[PDB]
């Protein structure tokens, strides 16, 4: 992987595995979503972050702040197959004080051709109080110069599917699957649960018929709140229509949201 | 990932991945365990294997017979750490009618250093009525020209862990993590179980105080039964023993019914 000429964006190429494949013998929606991590924690090492906090800059550090997502947008066009080369670029850019973005344009790597996008929007927060905030202009200045300037969009289109608020599944829900649990595999290097499991756990939802006759389009997902190692989730989908669907994912005692998300399936 | 000059054995690289490591930011066993499947799935198709069946040879395709891992056996002596390069070789090698072998060294590209080794046992199983059967002379000889004739072991010694039989759990268990359930990220391109899950589940019943004071170096798991994937599962941990042992047993949830029985041999941090 390394930084493109202009040190605004960074690419790195990976190699399909035999495991990271799931019924069509193509890569899972959760294996995208890992190598879009993998390459945004690439590109931060690339351009002087720490090991210690990813994206960290010197203040956020003394004020005990962090970014975490706050939405995740994924489309795909072609899913690579096991053996497959795919090129992820990723970059970064500053939206005022509400919080930063990061794209990023998936390539199959022989042929130059667009297979897929995604965008997320990241905000900051406390890492005690869990206290989210405006981000400051101290701060703001300090990650400019790794941005580009003029906007970079991977979804330029004004209010489309990456930009639209997502509504709360009423019950009783079409489908559900109860009593998630993560295991260690399903934590990160801090012992917080990852953010694609959140993703595997709102398709779990999904029937296996409609993930046998169709291939995911569309994904968007709203972070409200974690999940703990010691929690346990309910997944809830309701068919809204291609095949679209509403999810919502809440711990299984008490209720309380997790996150929301829709999918947009088109038939194989 | 190449063969090596003989043609015997094949070797690979891998950069550890942000999201591939724990709490120590080091490589969990759960992602070695998945870089020794890949690399032995990668071996496989440089010596002419299909896509369409694991190493399953000629002969195996016409009588619907594929290979099952019997026994994993794993010992790491370093974990490679986020941004790492690993550099893993396997070979495979003929045990007579049982079945086959596949070993494996992990060293640290840099230093050339090995870091790890592990061993597993396969054994031949008709993939619909899934009964066991020795190797026939056919299948045999099939596979001869891409194994080593004289034995090469990555567990030479004549006292050695990897080939101990293993004992199974008593009720009560000190420890134990109810209701597992796979999902759709645990299932391998054939809607199957992926053998490292297993791993995964087994572990979760050590205390997560083990985890934080001491490091994994060896494990050894038999496989008995497949978890199917509305299976639910109950993982059961006993200590048996500065290094703590801990005798491990995988159920159904239901009836009791019998999927893995392992060993794991732990060091104090
Ligand atoms: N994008 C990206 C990388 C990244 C994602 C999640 C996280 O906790 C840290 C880094
Ligand atoms: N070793 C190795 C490769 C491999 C493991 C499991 C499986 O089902 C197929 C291939």
């Not at 991590?37 to 002087?48: D, I, L, T």
């Not at 344009?105 to 042929?111: A, C, F, G, R």
């Not at 095949?243 to 209720?255: A, C, N, P």
């Amino acid at each position: 992987g390394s930084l493109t000429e202009d040190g605004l964006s960074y690419k790195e190429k990976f190699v399909v595995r035999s495991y990271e494949v799931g019924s069509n013998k193509t890569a899972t929606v959760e294996t995208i979503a890992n190598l879009l991590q993998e390459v945004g924690c690439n590109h931060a090492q690339s351009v002087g972050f720490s090991t210690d906090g990813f994206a960290t800059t010197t203040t956020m550090r003394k004020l005990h702040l962090i970014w975490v997502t706050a939405r995740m947008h994924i489309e795909i066009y072609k899913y690579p197959a096991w053996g497959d080369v795919v090129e992820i670029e990723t970059w970064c850019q500053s939206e005022g004080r509400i919080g930063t973005r990061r794209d990023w344009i998936l390539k199959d790597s022989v042929t130059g051709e667009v297979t897929g996008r995604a965008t997320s929007k990241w905000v900051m927060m406390n890492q005690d109080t869990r206290r989210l905030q405006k981000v400051s202009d101290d701060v703001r200045d300090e990650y400019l110069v790794f941005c580009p300037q003029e906007p970079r969009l991977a979804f330029p289109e004004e209010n489309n599917r990456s930009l639209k608020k997502i509504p709360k599944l009423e019950d009783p829900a079409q489908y559900s699957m109860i009593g998630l649990k993560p295991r260690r595999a399903d934590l990160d290097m801090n012992q917080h649960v990852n953010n694609v499991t959140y993703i595997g756990w709102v398709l779990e939802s999904i029937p296996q018929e409609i993930v046998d006759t169709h291939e995911l389009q569309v994904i968007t997902l709203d972070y409200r709140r974690e999940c703990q190692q010691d929690d346990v989730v309910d997944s809830l989908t309701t068919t809204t229509s291609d095949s679209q669907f509403l999810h919502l994912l809440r711990l299984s005692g008490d209720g309380q949201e997790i996150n929301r998300g829709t999918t947009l399936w088109r038939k194989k």
